[PDB]
Amino acid sequence: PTVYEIRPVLPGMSEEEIKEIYSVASYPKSDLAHLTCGEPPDRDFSNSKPTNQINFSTFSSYIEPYFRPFTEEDLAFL
């Protein structure tokens, strides 16, 4: 008697029908995926990883000069 399958979604459909497809009576409005830094590059990471990492402290101090607050000291460089 009832439908024994998952019907596909279609654009611009009514809210009640959309819940019928899911059967969960649920979905969020915004996917929030736009705030993602980006999709994973979809590569092969099975390659043997390097055996010599760099202390995270060194990297933390390496990029620190790129983020320090602006000051009148560097407003006189230009």
Next chain:
Amino acid sequence: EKPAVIEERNGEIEFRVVNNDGERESLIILTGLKCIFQKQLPKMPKDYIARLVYDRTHLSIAIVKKPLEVVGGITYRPFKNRKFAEIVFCAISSDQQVKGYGAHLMSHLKDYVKATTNIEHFLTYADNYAIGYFKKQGFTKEITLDKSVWMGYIKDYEGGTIMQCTMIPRIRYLEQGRMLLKQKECVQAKIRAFSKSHIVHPPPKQWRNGNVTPIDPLSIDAIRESGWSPDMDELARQPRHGPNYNQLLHLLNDMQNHASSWPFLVPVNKDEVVDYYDIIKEPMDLSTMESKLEADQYQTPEDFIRDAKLIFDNCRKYNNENTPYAKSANKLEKFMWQQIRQIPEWSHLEPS
């Protein structure tokens, strides 16, 4: 229809899929799930659970009661381009666990992802005491995905056991209970269209005179048409696995369930330690014995006992007695004899 089915139909419960958009309701539902997972997983830090649940890339399916009360839910991160999704948390409130919401919650999650994206495979790091629940839900401990697909993407969890599933396409899991019945009814009616067991046959003609003598089953008209043979009759009484598989399966689960066998869950890595193989000429762990058991290489119980003894000796051999490795290894040995002693059959195999 289980109690979860009826309750949802009448409106007692309802499922909400919510992410950290920033609304009022979405925050309450997320926070409720956070507390539940925290209760059931005391070993992990509370900060780590808070970050994962309140993340902007995860989803969460929850069961909600009339007065905004949350009983259970699951969390996952879908990798849309890799055709698989990861399950990171799962739990239901202990007080309400008796109802049986675990089965009905998995069905909704599988149905929802299936009808919203094109994901196929699920990968998870199951808990030690949750293996039974996952197995009944179609999961398996053997992985069929390729190494490159998921390596470097999912997150390792110490103390877990990886598992995989392959959703069957073009099915609606929620109405499974009615669909399989129909396929059961379709086949059963087919069988009932041929079986002659409904025919009340007369007494065998040899015994109609009151004399009981052996009768060849292949001589009778009904039996001969049935195709009975001496070969199938003798072959039908040999179980696929060993006669003691279930009892060992009980014991295997028990020792695995025991927290004292954790160091022997997986084999040691050659890269991490080089002398482990050099010193031990017969390095063995639980996985190695189980695979050999599946191959029927263990003809007698003594092989299992010797292998179990050799595991403890190897642990004591590679690791010093003062170190916890050997002391726990000897403690686990006591636990095994506790189970074996509970078994009268193997109680006499303990040496003096």
Next chain:
Amino acid sequence: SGEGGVKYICDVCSVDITSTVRIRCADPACHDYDLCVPCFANGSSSNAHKPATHSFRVIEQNSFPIFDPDWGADEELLLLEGAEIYGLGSWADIADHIGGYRTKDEVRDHYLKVYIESPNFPLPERCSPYDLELPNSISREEFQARKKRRIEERREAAKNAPPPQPKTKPTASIPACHEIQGYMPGRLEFETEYCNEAEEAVQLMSFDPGDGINPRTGELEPEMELKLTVMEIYNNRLTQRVERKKVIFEHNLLEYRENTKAEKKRSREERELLNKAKPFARMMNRHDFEQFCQGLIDELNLRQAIAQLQEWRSMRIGDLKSGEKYEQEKALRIQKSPPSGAALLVAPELPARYK
């Protein structure tokens, strides 16, 4: 036993009879009195059973193809029965339940073709009981012979089969592959973030069940409006992290080896100038930053060349060739007492990009 099935035992010889051809005593005197074919062949009677004057029933094993030439009725049911108990999807155990040494792959493939791939989706294609060709296309004895033949060879193969290799250590994902300890290129997430201590304020948070709106006033009660406000700050903390990550991806700041080597190769004066203009990269894209830095280097080198040439002309040097000769001898004299940008501009042939 976890299995929910029912085990059937003969009432005379106590020989398991569930999976073979069997006979029962149909007389009302005997209830559920099953006699195995050996018993009903040898005629061993017990209780009220009389093999002489009571009519009986022959229960057959229903061994014949219906859908697939390699599968019979019994195998199909055990497949469907296994689905109910072991759960549709668990192919490892259900294959074991079905028996016959059918690895999980064959069972998995069979179900997909028989049921899932059927046009009559909820059912098979041959739902009609009237079709009875497959049963009559192969005799039962022939089909049984094949089953015994496949079984014996498979058993022989398994006994001679090589032992399975021990399970290697599970292939931990270890997302720390990237050449920076605590970075996950697969997930684009660090382990120690900008304000990793931002969760310390909401990881004990709890909410009053069923609340959210004041029944009387209709406005959020004071505790709730305070609780939500301390969640707004956390959301902003997350957004600040993302912007920091977004900047780092651009400009290729994850290449420690490549970025450093060029800094080493450069000279002292150029190094100071680049270090002085580093902060402004937050506002410009990749190309603009490259153009910005290159311009400063171009001006500095041009000043050096012009100053160098003016010194030569006061010494009465009248050709670019002799100028280099003089510099070499001067270096020897001061000692007695690849080329840089300032040395490529003063070459006999000017670079193309300066014409």
Next chain:
Amino acid sequence: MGPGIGDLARTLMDRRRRWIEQIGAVFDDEGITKCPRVEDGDTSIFGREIMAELIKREKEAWDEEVEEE
């Protein structure tokens, strides 16, 4: 674990809200916190249409300095 909300917590939420709603309106422009990306297209902050005027003004200042110098 506590009771009513303290006055300090009731008079701090509005102070935070007053600051965000009134002052924050000035900084509404989206570019105050973002780093333009190369993938977007001609997002360079050095468009010729504007660089033409900046160069002319810089040339003007140079001439004035020379005259003063």
